[PDB]
């Protein structure tokens, strides 16, 4: 690019409201076909894609989400929905814009777009200005010098897309690959009952009226809002060392595991993590320490592989927000082999998920750092 000029945004842009919608059908199960794309995670379940006055999402418009946000951007990928607040941005001119280009340039200004605090509509403000343009090279080689840089950006967006795809296939194949190996073990491995591997501790919760018991401290606290991770070394909450006077808790060792028993299961998969610090957890979950006949990683990956059946074993317990009983969680038998079939196969499956799992020794250290430096390469490339 030889000549760089700043141009207003609304000069080469047709903005429009979405077309009229009546798409409140009562069931929109996965057997249907349209991609309903929304804000945040841009996918809700399907609907029938024809003859509803559907906007049908042609070859490359873009969108904006939302009222109060005006920041979320997604490529209209192939042919998708119009999902009732998708305000549409396209161009009248076609020989200059190629508005995936201005998709790639619109996410380069986080100045005002990182401030969502008040209740406003911002349509005219981004409708004004600005954008950097290779004008006045139009229409000879304006988009021709943009071809190299959109090749850069398209290959790098493709890098992010393929990394998400291989992370998906990695976790899928790894989740099932945990369980031809290490499973149906014969013959014949002792079906040792849980709780006969070690005196595991219940939990306990202090009341949060006392500021002296709550304001400071260094004992780590475990609550299921901080769970959902893998290999928790610390959490959001550190509880007071004096507060164990009436915490009704037990101080557990530094090679422990922890398991939720409230409101994560009965809908989805219960998480688990190697907890590495001596910590305390609440009423609403349980702390598990095993005893000397084992490696604790083996019990961890055993529960993390058999979670889909130990949630089945005591699933309902009424229609409650409370969940799985203590007794049927206590009374499950896992195969516990000889000592040679612990450390080797747990180093196998532990090296495999320390390939996978977040963060340190994992793929996200690659993925988000590529995202960060991709955004920085965008900002470095787009100056004059």
């Amino acid at each position: 690019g030889v000549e760089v000029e700043w141009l207003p945004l609304g000069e080469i842009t047709k903005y429009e409201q979405p077309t009229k919608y009546l798409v409140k059908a009562k069931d929109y199960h996965d057997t249907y076909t349209i991609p309903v794309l929304t804000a945040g995670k841009t996918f809700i379940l399907g609907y029938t894609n024809e003859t509803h006055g559907i906007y049908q999402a042609s070859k490359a418009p873009v969108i904006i989400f939302d009222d109060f946000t005006t920041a979320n951007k997604w490529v209209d990928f192939d042919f998708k929905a119009k999902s009732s607040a998708m305000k549409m941005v396209t161009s009248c001119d076609d020989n200059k814009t190629l508005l995936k280009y201005v998709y790639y340039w619109l996410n380069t200004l986080p100045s005002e777009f990182a401030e969502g605090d008040h209740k406003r509509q911002w349509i005219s403000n981004y409708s004004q200005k600005k954008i950097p343009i290779p004008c006045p090279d139009n229409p000879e080689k304006s988009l021709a010098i943009q071809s190299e840089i959109v090749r850069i950006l398209d290959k790098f967006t493709a890098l992010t897309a393929e990394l998400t795809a291989e992370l998906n296939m990695r976790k899928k194949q790894y989740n099932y690959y945990r369980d031809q190996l290490l499973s149906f073990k014969e013959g014949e491995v002792e079906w040792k009952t849980l709780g006969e591997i070690g005196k595991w501790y219940g939990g306990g919760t202090p009341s949060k009226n006392k500021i002296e018991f709550w304001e400071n401290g260094s004992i780590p606290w475990i609550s299921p809002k901080d769970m959902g991770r893998t290999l928790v070394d610390s959490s959001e909450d550190y509880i007071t060392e004096e507060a164990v006077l009436h915490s009704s808790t037990k101080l557990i060792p530094a090679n422990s595991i922890a398991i939720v028993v409230r409101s994560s299961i009965l809908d989805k998969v219960l998480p688990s993590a190697l907890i590495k610090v001596p910590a305390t957890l609440n009423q609403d979950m349980k702390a598990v320490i095993p005893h000397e006949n084992i490696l604790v990683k083996y019990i961890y990956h055993m529960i993390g592989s058999r979670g889909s059946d130990i949630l089945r074993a005591a699933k309902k317990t009424g229609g409650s927000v409370a969940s799985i009983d203590s007794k049927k969680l206590f009374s499950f038998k896992i195969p516990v082999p000889n000592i040679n079939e612990q450390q080797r196969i747990v180093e196998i499956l532990d090296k495999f998920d320390t390939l996978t799992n977040s963060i340190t020794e994992g793929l996200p250290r690659e993925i988000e750092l590529r995202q960060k430096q991709y955004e920085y390469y965008r900002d470095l490339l787009f100056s004059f």
Binding site: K119, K351, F352, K372, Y376
Partner: protein
């Protein structure tokens, strides 16, 4: 706190166990009757009588009628009613509030003591109930100016629907003040209660006394609690009035005055139909506006009422809504008329929440008639410790941050600053475009995140290697 907590507990014992809007009237009547009981005692003993009798003077009665205007008797007070516990029947107070409210001569502020109503199911249920209530009321720890201080929480027992939080009262007090030691203070349209009227002059009575406190409000029980609010807090008598009615439809005094300071607090949805159905198209104060205020945005009708009653020596201090870009075509030009001169001095935003379920912050518009003329938008969002105001509710010195910003045009990074007159002529006169200074701006570096990612991929290669090796157990 010191005696906030003990009298707090003894008074919150009384709240049980039904809807407090009705028996709060009995609580108001009991505490008001006890304040009369001790105020008139403080007059007449200034050491003679522990308890009184029924005297027949009619001259010694009429001396406080022109002076205090609470003239019932000597021995019809709460210190003297405690001999008559569960006194059959309940509505002798309905007699005992009538002859103090004869009050024809002179200067009444009466037609006022109709708080203690009659419900109740029968008379004996009322008798046992007010016996227990007066037992809890006299059982309060007496101690002496702080006696209405717990009554402060009695005006905020619902707000933990519209009175004030106290830090806003101190803010509007320190914005109406100071440097204007001249007649008069104060005027108040949409008065609500006298809480925000209180801490301006109740702290600054020794600064100057000038004239009366001028209120007006709509709701009848709110009118009653407002006209007892400044009564109970040891403020004087003479011109401290609150009138009844809508301030828009019935403003008075018209002549009195272009004032020196006003305070207010308007609620949302206080609407009225424009533009107009009434004769306020042809009024004495909306001719400066040109076009008039629409229905659901009746807040700026108060601020167009405000420039009527204010002198160029004096200044304004009111609060408004952040829900604005231009508010229709009939208020963008009203904001244009506000910025058309140097009507607005400063504007100050706050932080969410530090209110009672709003959950958003507010605008605070401070006006005068004085030429500089830069529309300095000294907003704030942090800090503003908006979690709780209990960091020294007496003297926080948190406005000392704001008064220090108020000192001389403070251009503070990650804070507001003195912005120009024609910086806002470029915008459509919003609040705030400037400044909102640019926190959490984060970017990256070329090569630091990639040799890392290369090491991560080389960890991934040997992970692939022992994946391929360990396919056979």
């Amino acid at each position: 706190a010191e005696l906030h907590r003990q009298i707090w507990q003894i008074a919150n014992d009384v709240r049980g166990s039904v809807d407090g809007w009705d028996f709060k009237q009995y609580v108001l009547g009991a505490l008001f009757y006890r304040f009369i009981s001790e105020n008139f005692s403080s007059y007449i003993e200034a050491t003679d009588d522990i308890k009184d009798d029924a005297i027949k003077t009619k001259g010694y009665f009429i001396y406080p009628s022109q002076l205090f205007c609470n003239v019932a008797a000597k021995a019809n007070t709460n210190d003297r009613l405690n001999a008559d516990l569960n006194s059959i029947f309940v509505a002798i107070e309905s007699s005992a509030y009538g002859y103090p409210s004869e009050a024809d001569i002179k200067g009444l502020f009466a037609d006022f003591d109709t708080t203690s109503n009659r419900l109740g199911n029968t008379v004996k249920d009322k008798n046992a109930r007010l016996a227990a209530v007066l037992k809890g009321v006299e059982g309060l720890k007496l101690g002496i100016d702080l006696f209405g201080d717990a009554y402060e929480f009695l005006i905020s027992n619902y707000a933990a629907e519209f009175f004030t939080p106290q830090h806003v009262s101190k803010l509007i007090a320190q914005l109406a003040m100071h440097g204007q030691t001249h007649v008069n203070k104060i005027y108040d349209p949409a008065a609500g209660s006298g809480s925000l009227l209180l801490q301006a002059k109740k702290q600054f009575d020794n600064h100057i006394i000038e004239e009366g406190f001028f209120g007006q409000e709509i709701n009848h029980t709110t009118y009653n609690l407002a006209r007892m609010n400044m009564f109970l807090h040891n403020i004087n008598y003479d011109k401290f009035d609150i009138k009844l009615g809508n301030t828009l439809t019935e403003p008075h005094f018209r002549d009195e005055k272009p004032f020196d300071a006003i305070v207010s607090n308007p609620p949302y949805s206080v609407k009225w139909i424009g533009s107009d159905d009434p004769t306020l198209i042809n009024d004495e104060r909306f001719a400066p506006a040109g076009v008039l205020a629409p229905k659901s945005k009746a807040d700026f009708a108060f601020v167009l009422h405000a420039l009527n009653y204010l002198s160029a020596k004096g200044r304004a201090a009111i609060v408004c809504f952040p829900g604005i870009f231009y508010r229709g075509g009939a208020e963008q030009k009203i904001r244009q008329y506000l910025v058309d001169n140097n009507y607005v001095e400063t504007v100050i935003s706050l932080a969410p929440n530090l209110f009672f379920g709003t959950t958003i912050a507010v605008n605070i518009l401070v006006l005068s008639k004085h030429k500089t003329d830069t529309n300095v938008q000294f907003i704030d969002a942090s800090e503003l410790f908006k979690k709780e105001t209990n960091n020294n509710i007496l003297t926080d010195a948190h406005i000392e941050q704001i008064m220090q910003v108020f000192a001389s045009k403070e251009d503070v990074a990650h804070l507001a600053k003195s912005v120009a007159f024609e910086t806002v002529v470029a915008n459509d006169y919003n609040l705030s475009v400037s400044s909102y200074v640019e926190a959490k701006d984060n970017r990256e570096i070329i090569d630091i995140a990639e040799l890392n990612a290369e090491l991560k991929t080389t960890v991934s290669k040997i992970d692939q290697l022992r994946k391929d090796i360990d396919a056979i157990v």
